[PDB]
Amino acid sequence: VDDVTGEKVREAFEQFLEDFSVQSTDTGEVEKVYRAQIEFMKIYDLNTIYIDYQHLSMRENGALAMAISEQYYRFLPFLQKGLRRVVRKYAPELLNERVFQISFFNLPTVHRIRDIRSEKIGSLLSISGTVTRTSEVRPELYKASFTCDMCRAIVDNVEQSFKYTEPTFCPNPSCENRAFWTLNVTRSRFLDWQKVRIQENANEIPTGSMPRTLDVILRGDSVERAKPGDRCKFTGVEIVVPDVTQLGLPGVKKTTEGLNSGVTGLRSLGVRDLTYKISFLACHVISIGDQEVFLNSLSSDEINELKEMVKDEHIYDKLVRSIAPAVFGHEAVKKGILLQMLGGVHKSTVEGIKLRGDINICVVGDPSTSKSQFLKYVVGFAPRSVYTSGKASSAAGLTAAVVRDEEGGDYTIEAGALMLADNGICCIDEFDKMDISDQVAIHEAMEQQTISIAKAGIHATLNARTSILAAANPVGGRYNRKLSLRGNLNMTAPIMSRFDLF
Amino acid sequence: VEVIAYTCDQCGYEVFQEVNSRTFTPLSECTSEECSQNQTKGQLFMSTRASKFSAFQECKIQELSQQVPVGHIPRSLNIHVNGTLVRSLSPGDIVDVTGIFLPAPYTGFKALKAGLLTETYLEAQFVRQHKKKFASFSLTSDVEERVMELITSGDVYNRLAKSIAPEIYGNLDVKKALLLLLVGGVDKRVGDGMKIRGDINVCLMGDPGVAKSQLLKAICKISPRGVYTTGKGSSGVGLTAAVMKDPVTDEMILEGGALVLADNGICCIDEFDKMDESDRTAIHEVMEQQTISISKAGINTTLNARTSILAAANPLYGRYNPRLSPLDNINLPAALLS
Amino acid sequence: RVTLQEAPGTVPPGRLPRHREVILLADLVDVSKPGEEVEVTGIYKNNYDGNLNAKNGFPVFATIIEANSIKRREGNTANEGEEGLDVFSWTEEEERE
Amino acid sequence: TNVSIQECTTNFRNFLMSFKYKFRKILDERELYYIKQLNEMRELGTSNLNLDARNLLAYKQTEDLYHQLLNYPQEVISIMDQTIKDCMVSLIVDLDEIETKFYKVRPYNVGSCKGMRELNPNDIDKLINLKGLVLRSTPVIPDMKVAFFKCNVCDHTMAVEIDRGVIQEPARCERIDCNEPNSMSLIHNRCSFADKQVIKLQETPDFVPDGQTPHSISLCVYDELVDSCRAGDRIEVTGTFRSIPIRANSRQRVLKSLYKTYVDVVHVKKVQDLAKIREVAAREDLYSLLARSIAPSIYELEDVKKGILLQLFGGTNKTFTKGGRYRGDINILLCGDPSTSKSQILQYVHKITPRGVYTSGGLTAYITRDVDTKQLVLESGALVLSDGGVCCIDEFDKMSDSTRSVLHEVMEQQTISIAKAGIITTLNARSSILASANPIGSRYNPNLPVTENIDLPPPLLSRFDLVYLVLDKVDEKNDRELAKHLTNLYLVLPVEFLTMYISYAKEHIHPIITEAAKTELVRAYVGMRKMGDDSRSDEKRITATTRQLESMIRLAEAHAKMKLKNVVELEDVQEAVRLIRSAIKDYATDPK
DNA sequence: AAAAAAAAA
Ligand SMILES: Nc1ncnc2c1ncn2[C@@H]1O[C@H](COP(=O)(O)OP(=O)(O)OP(=O)(O)O)[C@@H](O)[C@H]1O
Ligand SMILES: Nc1ncnc2c1ncn2[C@@H]1O[C@H](COP(=O)(O)OP(=O)(O)O)[C@@H](O)[C@H]1O
Ligand SMILES: Nc1ncnc2c1ncn2[C@@H]1O[C@H](COP(=O)(O)OP(=O)(O)O)[C@@H](O)[C@H]1O
Ligand SMILES: [Mg+2]
Ligand SMILES: [Zn+2]
Ligand SMILES: [Zn+2]
Ligand SMILES: [Zn+2]
Numbered sequence A: 001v002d003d004v005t006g007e008k009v010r011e012a013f014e015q016f017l018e019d020f021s022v023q024s025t026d027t028g029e030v031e032k033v034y035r036a037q038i039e040f041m042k043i044y045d046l047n048t049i050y051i052d053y054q055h056l057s058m059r060e061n062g063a064l065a066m067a068i069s070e071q072y073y074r075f076l077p078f079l080q081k082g083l084r085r086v087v088r089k090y091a092p093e094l095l096n097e098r099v100f101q102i103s104f105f106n107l108p109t110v111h112r113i114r115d116i117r118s119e120k121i122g123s124l125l126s127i128s129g130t131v132t133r134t135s136e137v138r139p140e141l142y143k144a145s146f147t148c149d150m151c152r153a154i155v156d157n158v159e160q161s162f163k164y165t166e167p168t169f170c171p172n173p174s175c176e177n178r179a180f181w182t183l184n185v186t187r188s189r190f191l192d193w194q195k196v197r198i199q200e201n202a203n204e205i206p207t208g209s210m211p212r213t214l215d216v217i218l219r220g221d222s223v224e225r226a227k228p229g230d231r232c233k234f235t236g237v238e239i240v241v242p243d244v245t246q247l248g249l250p251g252v253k254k255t256t257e258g259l260n261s262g263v264t265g266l267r268s269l270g271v272r273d274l275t276y277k278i279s280f281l282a283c284h285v286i287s288i289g290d291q292e293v294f295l296n297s298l299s300s301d302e303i304n305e306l307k308e309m310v311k312d313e314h315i316y317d318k319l320v321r322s323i324a325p326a327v328f329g330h331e332a333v334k335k336g337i338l339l340q341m342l343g344g345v346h347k348s349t350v351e352g353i354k355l356r357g358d359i360n361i362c363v364v365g366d367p368s369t370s371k372s373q374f375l376k377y378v379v380g381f382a383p384r385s386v387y388t389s390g391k392a393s394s395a396a397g398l399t400a401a402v403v404r405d406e407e408g409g410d411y412t413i414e415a416g417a418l419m420l421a422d423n424g425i426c427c428i429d430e431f432d433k434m435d436i437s438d439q440v441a442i443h444e445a446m447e448q449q450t451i452s453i454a455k456a457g458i459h460a461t462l463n464a465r466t467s468i469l470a471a472a473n474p475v476g477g478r479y480n481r482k483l484s485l486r487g488n489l490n491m492t493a494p495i496m497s498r499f500d501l502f
Numbered sequence B: 001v002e003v004i005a006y007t008c009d010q011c012g013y014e015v016f017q018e019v020n021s022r023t024f025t026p027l028s029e030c031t032s033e034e035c036s037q038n039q040t041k042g043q044l045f046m047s048t049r050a051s052k053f054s055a056f057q058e059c060k061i062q063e064l065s066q067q068v069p070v071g072h073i074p075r076s077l078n079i080h081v082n083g084t085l086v087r088s089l090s091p092g093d094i095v096d097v098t099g100i101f102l103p104a105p106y107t108g109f110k111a112l113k114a115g116l117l118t119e120t121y122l123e124a125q126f127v128r129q130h131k132k133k134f135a136s137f138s139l140t141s142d143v144e145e146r147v148m149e150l151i152t153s154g155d156v157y158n159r160l161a162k163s164i165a166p167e168i169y170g171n172l173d174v175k176k177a178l179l180l181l182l183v184g185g186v187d188k189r190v191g192d193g194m195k196i197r198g199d200i201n202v203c204l205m206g207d208p209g210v211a212k213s214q215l216l217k218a219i220c221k222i223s224p225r226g227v228y229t230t231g232k233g234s235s236g237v238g239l240t241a242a243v244m245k246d247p248v249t250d251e252m253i254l255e256g257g258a259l260v261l262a263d264n265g266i267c268c269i270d271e272f273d274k275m276d277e278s279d280r281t282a283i284h285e286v287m288e289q290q291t292i293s294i295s296k297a298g299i300n301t302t303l304n305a306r307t308s309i310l311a312a313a314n315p316l317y318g319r320y321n322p323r324l325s326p327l328d329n330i331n332l333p334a335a336l337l338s
Numbered sequence C: 001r002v003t004l005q006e007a008p009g010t011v012p013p014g015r016l017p018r019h020r021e022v023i024l025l026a027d028l029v030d031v032s033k034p035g036e037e038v039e040v041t042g043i044y045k046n047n048y049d050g051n052l053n054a055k056n057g058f059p060v061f062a063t064i065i066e067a068n069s070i071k072r073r074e075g076n077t078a079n080e081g082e083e084g085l086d087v088f089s090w091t092e093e094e095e096r097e
Numbered sequence D: 001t002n003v004s005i006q007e008c009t010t011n012f013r014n015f016l017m018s019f020k021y022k023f024r025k026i027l028d029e030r031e032l033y034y035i036k037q038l039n040e041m042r043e044l045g046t047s048n049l050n051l052d053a054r055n056l057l058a059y060k061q062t063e064d065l066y067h068q069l070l071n072y073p074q075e076v077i078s079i080m081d082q083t084i085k086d087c088m089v090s091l092i093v094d095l096d097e098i099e100t101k102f103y104k105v106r107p108y109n110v111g112s113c114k115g116m117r118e119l120n121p122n123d124i125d126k127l128i129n130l131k132g133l134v135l136r137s138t139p140v141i142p143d144m145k146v147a148f149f150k151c152n153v154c155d156h157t158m159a160v161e162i163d164r165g166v167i168q169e170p171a172r173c174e175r176i177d178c179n180e181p182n183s184m185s186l187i188h189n190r191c192s193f194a195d196k197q198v199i200k201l202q203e204t205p206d207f208v209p210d211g212q213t214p215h216s217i218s219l220c221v222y223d224e225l226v227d228s229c230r231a232g233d234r235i236e237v238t239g240t241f242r243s244i245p246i247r248a249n250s251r252q253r254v255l256k257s258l259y260k261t262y263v264d265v266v267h268v269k270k271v272q273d274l275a276k277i278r279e280v281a282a283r284e285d286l287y288s289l290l291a292r293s294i295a296p297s298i299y300e301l302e303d304v305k306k307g308i309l310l311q312l313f314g315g316t317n318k319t320f321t322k323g324g325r326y327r328g329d330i331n332i333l334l335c336g337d338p339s340t341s342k343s344q345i346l347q348y349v350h351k352i353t354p355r356g357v358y359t360s361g362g363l364t365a366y367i368t369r370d371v372d373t374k375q376l377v378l379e380s381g382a383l384v385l386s387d388g389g390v391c392c393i394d395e396f397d398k399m400s401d402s403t404r405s406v407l408h409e410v411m412e413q414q415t416i417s418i419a420k421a422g423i424i425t426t427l428n429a430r431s432s433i434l435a436s437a438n439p440i441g442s443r444y445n446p447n448l449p450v451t452e453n454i455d456l457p458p459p460l461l462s463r464f465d466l467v468y469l470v471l472d473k474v475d476e477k478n479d480r481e482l483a484k485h486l487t488n489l490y491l492v493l494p495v496e497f498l499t500m501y502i503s504y505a506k507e508h509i510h511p512i513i514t515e516a517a518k519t520e521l522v523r524a525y526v527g528m529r530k531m532g533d534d535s536r537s538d539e540k541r542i543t544a545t546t547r548q549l550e551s552m553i554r555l556a557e558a559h560a561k562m563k564l565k566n567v568v569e570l571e572d573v574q575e576a577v578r579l580i581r582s583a584i585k586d587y588a589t590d591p592k
Numbered sequence E: 001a002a003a004a005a006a007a008a009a
Helices: A004-018 A033-044 A053-057 A065-069 A072-090 A291-296 A300-310 A315-322 A331-342 A372-381 A436-448 A493-498 B141-152 B157-164 B172-183 B212-222 B277-285 C050-056 C092-096 D007-017 D022-028 D033-044 D053-057 D062-071 D073-092 D274-281 D286-293 D302-313 D342-352 D402-411 D450-454 D458-462 D476-490 D497-508 D515-531 D546-564 D570-585
Strands: A048-052 A101-105 A124-133 A138-148 A153-159 A181-183 A189-199 A213-219 A231-242 A276-287 A361-364 A386-389 A400-403 A412-415 A424-429 A450-455 A458-463 A466-472 B003-007 B016-018 B045-052 B056-062 B076-082 B096-104 B119-128 B202-205 B226-229 B263-270 B306-313 C002-004 C020-023 C038-047 C062-072 D049-052 D105-108 D128-136 D141-151 D156-161 D192-202 D216-222 D234-245 D259-270 D331-336 D358-360 D366-369 D376-379 D390-394 D415-420 D423-428 D432-437 D466-470
Touching: A004 A065, A004 A072, A033 A048, A033 A072, A048 A053, A053 A065, A053 A101, A065 A072, A072 A101, A072 A231, A101 A231, A101 A276, A124 D376, A138 C062, A276 D141, A315 A331, A331 A361, A331 A372, A331 A466, A372 A386, A372 A424, A372 A466, A386 D402, A400 A450, A412 A458, A412 D415, A436 A450, A436 A466, A436 A493, B045 D234, B157 B172, B157 B212, B172 B202, B172 B212, B212 B226, B212 B263, B212 B306, D007 D033, D007 D062, D007 D073, D022 D053, D033 D073, D049 D053, D053 D062, D062 D073, D073 D105, D105 D259, D128 D216, D128 D259, D274 D497, D274 D546, D286 D302, D286 D546, D302 D331, D302 D342, D302 D432, D302 D466, D302 D497, D302 D546, D302 D570, D331 D342, D331 D450, D342 D358, D342 D390, D342 D432, D366 D415, D402 D415, D402 D458, D450 D458, D466 D570, D497 D546, D515 D546, D515 D570, D546 D570
Parallel strands: A048 A101, A213 A276, A361 A466, A386 A424, A424 A466, B076 B119, B202 B306, B226 B263, B263 B306, C020 C062, D049 D105, D216 D259, D331 D432, D331 D466, D358 D390, D390 D432
Antiparallel strands: A124 A189, A124 A231, A138 A153, A138 A181, A138 A189, A189 A213, A231 A276, A400 A412, A450 A458, B003 B016, B003 B045, B056 B076, B096 B119, C002 C020, C038 C062, D128 D192, D128 D234, D141 D156, D141 D192, D192 D216, D234 D259, D366 D376, D415 D423
């Protein structure tokens, strides 16, 4: 039976892929977004395509856009066939036969996790939440090839499902596939696979209710695109996953209350009941929370402004004036912070001795004279910058710590602020009240750029390439002009030699 | 279940079955004539309305401490009860149960061991509740003449104080304070919703060996709502429900933040300085009829604590000191003392 | 066979390491030691597994690494002076020199 | 049974068109609800009908249908829904909106509310009414309704209806042109499903008189009842009773001798005023009455009440790009001996404010290990939950040490970051703090300064917006006044109108300061700078900090916030300076 | 469920 509806939607899809012909600007008379895209894949040998849902909106109105969005699972192979048809009409050698992928983006609205209901199963949807855990990138069987052992005939292109399925017949007339098949690994094609977990934000959750959790499955080029702790927006199709354990498998076989929506009466089920649960499949992920290389990023403004502020006569006189316009006064501190941001060259000796190539600055003064403002500005301006306090509630503190679950084989280290501040600027506030362990680890952290630890059977040497900036309050509240830095401050002499400017 | 009935999809009579075993198996085909015909006519389905059911309950009983031989651990016994006698007994009473002592198969565990060893249980037939009855002072003629006699007795509270603990000598004022504690103070709120409690909180101080512990035990005996607790020793007495992780299904039954019968209860504590920070926080939380709202997993079923607090303690020196008495105090924060 | 983690100096800070399984054939036995950071050249292979499919609900395959060469990289991070599995080994002409 | 099908429908339809609640009015002994509500649904498009049993009981022919509904709920409800479906055409004589929507009823108040401690087997498959408190919920559970099958040889598909869950699989394809028996394999993602959800409910504590333990009963819901309740809700439900055999061993067809009990419910119940604002907002002495209204039982202490009310009003918040955000929250400390009833003020303000968490001396996010389910979930803390509101803290001195540093980063930056178990993220707090502390010892000695008695770090104390002191001293007059006042209590207050006014002020009012008040601000700053030095070169303490400037600015902006003003006036700045220097005048130690 | 070793408070 020919699903002419699928054929019609595929024909319309390939049609507006052919002749979308939207214009971007006046100079862009006819630009052909998807022809340019296919040329892009031609010149960079890619496999995925991106389709804007709004660009899909006006084509045939809801007879096409809605007919694709709602029964997406029903018409996905038809869209794949249309894409293959157009690409092999316009670019044969690109096929060199490959798993083309389509990612729809820019949906009209996003849904909360608490708004998920079964009536949208198989329909395109957009959801967002915080990623709390991911998994490894495992290979997954997609198209299998099998050998008919008793006759060694080949049956291939066997589509798979939630269960590992073998063929059911042999084309050889003399054979009747009484014996089973052996999988041809070098003939089958695998695809990447990763499972991530999401949950509702604190904004949507009312009262002290328990957050709702959902499981999202990635596939293709979207692997490792959602790191834990990130609020991201997922676009994909809602699906349902069964319990494969009750399903036939070669291997051996809140919850105690049961009352699940089981089903019985099938052949392979036997006397078992099949259960289901809701999971989401994603195809597009976005997040909402050398000098020649730089010169390669060419633009008119890139050339003009760079040349202008290189050939100027009074860059410095202006440059220091451009740092932290909010604060009042404190001319020298701005220059010091600018020099700290610029940094120093890093060199290594011929025999492998390393040289410290950064600038460490301490700021001292009586309370309320706008010292924390500089730290906040540099945190908000310098990339890979971390704000932290002298006294930290975490066991990591500043450098690192070791933790293990009670009678659980972890033996894992936890990263301190200095560890997170790698290749950046660490900003410590209230430097005075540190404790002994950090106070003795620091004067190794700065000068040697590395931290070493050996506790309870685990030893390691971690990189700590950081530029430090600290603030302090003189003992007694107000700085005593009669005495010196050593007299007023209680911080130790060896730490004093570490710093470069005051 | 006693008799299990199946419907036959409008095929004549609806097949019945009765199973007296503790396991049950269903039917597959039916004796209906058109169903007995050589092709299938409808799948038989169990009918809930047509079946006959019965109430079922189980309980276990322990040996009395007087009957245990020396150097042994008391044993238990399982009791099954069915019918109209269900819910005729409550935990924590002495009973005289008569029943039939029956064996029970081990095959329910399904271990394929103990070829001749079997489990045993008793099926209840008649229960004598025994023990005593509180009766909630339900008025009867005899107690009416009793209260008439009390009216004729004149002044009563002095005799009541004299009659609580004659084994402990003297200390008339302490017993008078105990009487005043038993009745309770002004209660049932005031205008515009301001909270007032009728409970009285009295703390007793003294050196060891003054029979204050014995007096506390006598008070607990005479007060039907009295409860005795102490710092640890038993863990399920403070900040945790008595049913936590209790059911065999491990259903995690819990109220959250609650104490032992703190609603209209008389809490008695010895060694008031002994308890750790958790029980100290609980006793500070139960202040002035304040409810306990400690949450752990989204639970907020607070226990409305309206209790009178009676505690006995001693200074760490073990003897009174000539120096400033607040230096002896209770070794507790002054806010709790006030 | 042995369990291989990620080097703490290579993992991005604040993240979790990734575990793999390494299989050592003859002549490779006891060459590596617990706690010693190593570098293994080997062959990547995949195979079927039951409970991995059971718990994931998808035809996922387990992967192991059949080792072919092992080089110790504990302490001495300077890895540019000379090439070879062991930089502390000498030839006959080097002995003559 | 075969009795209700014919005449009960006609009788109930007749009393549907012929019902007047005047019958119930006469029954009470101190109007066509159905038709008017049905036309309301017709003009609304909503498909929902509520039905009370007592009005259903008010008619003599209907009580027979009442008894029949008690015994046989499902069939009666189905025939009632069919009757209501036909009522569409019966009353409209657009027929297009009718054919798409289904219709259902919500019976309630059928029987008296019973308890889980008395549930005999005689009450199986009978409608009952239950109250309780929700313990836990569950995610939506799909439920198969239409099975989808495909003949893979010829790619032919068909839809198979189901019944009682069990699927009668077709053993041979309907297309006799191929007629293959083994060519069917279903599609999981092309079926149709229903949204079932399970709710765990506990009984009310009123049913336990003698220290027993509560018992839990499971619930089942469908469609509109999904997510209709959450944790901690107090609700009442009406529905039928159900009993099910348990599978025990999933490998075999053996069944236990005991049945699991659960209930299925159909109805659940829980447990232009802007003109009224401006009339009140235009009054002159609204400030004093508003300040005194939030604490009716508190005697005197007017200035602290004004300060707390202004803090509740809150200042403005701005996030200009090139300079960054500025704090808009107000943080107040209270100190004094435990003879002030200062906990009562915290309890008042916790419930007066829209959002606010009342805690004691954990407070922020920590990764938790889930109890009932075996997974790891990130959980937020109390301080995060008070975003935009006021966070109340009691017993501030007993704060330990690890948590204090947390506060030190929640006030100067109002953004907390957590880096644990591979999770690195930042959370917004934007919360106000109202804390109380006690002195060390039985009394706060006036000679000793504040810092020693409170036992707090000087920087944390300094970074508060304001601070207030209470010193109960024994005098005849004030003791007499308190005695009379409290005895009279022992023997002009608004309503949630206050809450809606606060919400309107927080949402729609964004006042700014003006150039006129700038001169007064500068003059006040100079004035307190002028007092900071004297005729001696001792370099007296510099009490005119920039924190004073920001405190004045926020207090003035909040003083423009209430009364629904849009720009500041002088009264704002004089009020701010007076209320900020009143505490400073009582901040001195024994000298001077 | 109960004993024994480790790092941080
Ligand atoms: N007034 C008294 N009359 C009779 N016996 C008394 C009296 N005071 C103390 N005793 C005796 O003291 C014992 C009970 O006092 P006990 O030492 O248990 O109380 P306590 O002061 O709470 O001390 P501790 O904390 O050491 O238990 C009994 O042996 C009792 O006979
Ligand atoms: N432009 C400015 N000039 C002078 N002081 C400022 C300026 N902006 C902010 N301030 C003040 O400086 C303080 C910055 O914090 P900081 O200097 O660390 O004092 P503290 O140690 O009391 O936090 C703020 O409290 C603010 O009142
Ligand atoms: N001005 C007052 N008006 C009414 N009651 C008061 C007043 N001052 C004290 N009280 C009474 O004294 C008690 C003081 O307790 P409080 O100081 O709040 O304890 P804490 O501060 O340790 O929680 C209150 O319970 C209150 O009933
Ligand atoms: Mg004692
Ligand atoms: Zn073959
Ligand atoms: Zn039949
Ligand atoms: Zn066919």
